[PDB]
Amino acid sequence: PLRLLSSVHYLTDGELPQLYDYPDDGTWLRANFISSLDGGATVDGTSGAMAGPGDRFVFNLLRELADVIVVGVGTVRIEGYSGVRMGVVQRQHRQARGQSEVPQLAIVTRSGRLDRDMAVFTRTEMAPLVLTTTAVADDTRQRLAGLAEVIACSGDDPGTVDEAVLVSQLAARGLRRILTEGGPTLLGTFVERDVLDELCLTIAPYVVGGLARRIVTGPGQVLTRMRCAHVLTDDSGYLYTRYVKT
Amino acid sequence: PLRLLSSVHYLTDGELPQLYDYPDDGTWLRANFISSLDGGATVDGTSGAMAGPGDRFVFNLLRELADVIVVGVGTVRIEGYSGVRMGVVQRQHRQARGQSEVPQLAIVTRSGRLDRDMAVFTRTEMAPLVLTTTAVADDTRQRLAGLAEVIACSGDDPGTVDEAVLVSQLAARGLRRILTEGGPTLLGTFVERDVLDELCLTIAPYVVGGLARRIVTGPGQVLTRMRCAHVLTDDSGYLYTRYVKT
Ligand SMILES: NC(=O)c1ccc[n+]([C@@H]2O[C@H](COP(=O)([O-])OP(=O)(O)OC[C@H]3O[C@@H](n4cnc5c(N)ncnc54)[C@H](OP(=O)(O)O)[C@@H]3O)[C@@H](O)[C@H]2O)c1
Ligand SMILES: NC(=O)c1ccc[n+]([C@@H]2O[C@H](COP(=O)([O-])OP(=O)(O)OC[C@H]3O[C@@H](n4cnc5c(N)ncnc54)[C@H](OP(=O)(O)O)[C@@H]3O)[C@@H](O)[C@H]2O)c1
Numbered sequence A, B: 001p002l003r004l005l006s007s008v009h010y011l012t013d014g015e016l017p018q019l020y021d022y023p024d025d026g027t028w029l030r031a032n033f034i035s036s037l038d039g040g041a042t043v044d045g046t047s048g049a050m051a052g053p054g055d056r057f058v059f060n061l062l063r064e065l066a067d068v069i070v071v072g073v074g075t076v077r078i079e080g081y082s083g084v085r086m087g088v089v090q091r092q093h094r095q096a097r098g099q100s101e102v103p104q105l106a107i108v109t110r111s112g113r114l115d116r117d118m119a120v121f122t123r124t125e126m127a128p129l130v131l132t133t134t135a136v137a138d139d140t141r142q143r144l145a146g147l148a149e150v151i152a153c154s155g156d157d158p159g160t161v162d163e164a165v166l167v168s169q170l171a172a173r174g175l176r177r178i179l180t181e182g183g184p185t186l187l188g189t190f191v192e193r194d195v196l197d198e199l200c201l202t203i204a205p206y207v208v209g210g211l212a213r214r215i216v217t218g219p220g221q222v223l224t225r226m227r228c229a230h231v232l233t234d235d236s237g238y239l240y241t242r243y244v245k246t
């Protein structure tokens, strides 16, 4: 009942985007994470040390394919997010697909307690969205006037983000091809709200020991079954997986 | 730089053991764990809910190949370990390889605070080892007389297990082909002591949310690079990976 996986194909620059195609229509929330073999999401507090050239390449590709990159403010601070960068060819590909040259960043915050000073606001070609609650949306909008488009993403509860609503507000703005890059709290909520369509997971060929948190945190205990759409690899033993919710 | 992995081979019952062969000589500490896509080691407190027929098959195979199955007492209690079971054919294969019919269980405990009552002691064809410290080995041996062979596994510090010493004591008893099945504390120590030779990791196609711990816990922060030896899959989207320390 077991099948050996082997490299059967070198992916061309044209085929790789195809493997990570978004659906033709409808919203699609894709997550891109990286974790060690022993499930650690961080090395020395952040994820980058696990990411080699292969993962950076995939990471940048998923950004290139996304209409919008949604990230928790925690990751934004910790990973030092600034504006999404797109190279000339990336911009060309994006135009060819009917997309803006650079995907927007969307920072998720229940508190809305974002400072005007952040690099997500400062070092950015594209002004970012701030996805927050109905309760704080107005004060946040005022505080962040000129810096970010503040969008209330509450459903029934004005004090919380409803993640389905969040996805919908993005789509409503024509940002239906969503990529989230974390963090584990945000991902946890997406998973709990059952709005995660796809998880692209780089499995870095490291064990990192017990300190690191997982790529999902929170009190949530779910068991969402996913289908393995693909596994890619590179010469360094990384697995670039793509799982789609069943 | 990216290669697509695909199933290229259906593994026969003869080839599968070959993929998980131990080295011809020397000690080899292999770990077998299972984790969800989001790095969770447990569902509802234990690992079994993530394990389908494929993982059980691999799990049983690794047991069949091992001279000894080393587990923390935590896992022993929580997963309700009793004696290793071997079917007739499993025993035959084991004999053919020069191995005893059933691998021993080795329970690791720094405290040595094991009760005579446990199923590891009671429902077992083979009496298990208790790998513990020099400091408690004697009282533990007395307490567990007739139930378990108690082995002191301290190196410099009589109050602790030295995991290299643990591996050595096993080999010393002709149990050089070691399988550890956990838990995360034990695995954490193996990883910290740098004695983990190989990690066989089932990646179950689930996200489980933030509650679960990882397959490694502890204060440890390492970055042990591993080489991806193989990835198998089944029809249900599980990845059966084998990584070998570089
Ligand atoms: N290995 C990987 O792939 C990966 C990927 C990303 C991040 N990381 C790492 O994980 C760490 C950060 O963890 P984190 O959990 O704090 O990241 P995070 O989820 O990005 O940040 C948490 C914050 O974002 C907001 N948030 C998240 N979900 C929300 C929701 N459903 N509704 C409203 N607000 C929401 C909240 O902000 P407010 O407090 O303002 O309400 C929350 O406090 C960093 O160390 C980073 O390196 C790893
Ligand atoms: N997903 C998976 O593949 C997988 C695999 C195994 C277990 N699990 C799960 O993980 C959980 C158990 O976690 P756990 O960390 O408590 O398991 P554990 O490592 O098996 O148990 C911990 C105990 O074993 C002893 N121990 C471990 N390492 C030691 C060392 N280097 N030296 C001396 N003693 C050592 C200690 O016993 P003393 O206190 O007596 O000193 C320690 O308290 C369960 O929920 C189980 O389901 C999951």
Ligand SMILES: COc1cc(NCc2ccc3[nH+]c(N)nc(N)c3c2C)cc(OC)c1OC
Binding pocket: A032, A033, A034, A046, A047, A048, A051, A055, A056, A059, A079, A080, A081, A082, A085, A180, A181, A182, A200, A201, A202
């Ligand atoms: C400044 O913005 C950036 C932030 C980060 N943060 C760390 C980082 C690294 C690898 C990653 N790899 C995957 N698979 N998924 C992630 N979620 C991820 C993250 C979160 C990494 C960047 O380069 C890869 C980057 O530049 C665009």
Ligand SMILES: COc1cc(NCc2ccc3[nH+]c(N)nc(N)c3c2C)cc(OC)c1OC
Binding pocket: B032, B033, B034, B046, B047, B048, B051, B055, B056, B059, B079, B080, B081, B082, B085, B180, B181, B182, B200, B201, B202
């Ligand atoms: C009674 O002993 C047993 C204990 C367990 N415990 C849970 C369990 C399940 C799947 C697993 N799968 C892998 N890849 N690695 C593990 N470490 C593992 C464990 C730890 C599972 C058993 O059946 C699979 C079993 O019977 C032999």
